[PDB]
Amino acid sequence: ELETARKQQQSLQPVALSWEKYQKQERQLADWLTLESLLPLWFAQQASH
């Protein structure tokens, strides 16, 4: 029983690691997407000026 719980948790932990670093890359992508939309607005401001 102890070994079973051990193995279950041990396998799950790398899943948590991958999930969290994936979340980090997801936030990075969301931010990059934000910059993409702001690029037309920014260069439109500058072009108007």
Binding site: Y22, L29, T34, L35, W42
Partner: protein, 50 residues
């Protein structure tokens, strides 16, 4: 948003103003390039996660 866009993006001189839209295309290409690069890394990372 203006702070971020100014920190990331440049501004052009008066007579090189026609070039600003070349910079628009170049910056759009760069933003999309980084978006897809991070997206593909997220792709492979999701592969590993699954």
């Amino acid at each position: 948003e203006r702070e971020l866009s100014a920190s990331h993006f440049p501004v052009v001189t008066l007579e090189q103003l026609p070039d600003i839209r070349d910079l628009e295309r170049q910056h759009e290409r760069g933003i999309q390039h980084e978006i897809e690069r991070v997206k593909a890394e997220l792709h492979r990372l999701n592969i590993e996660l699954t």
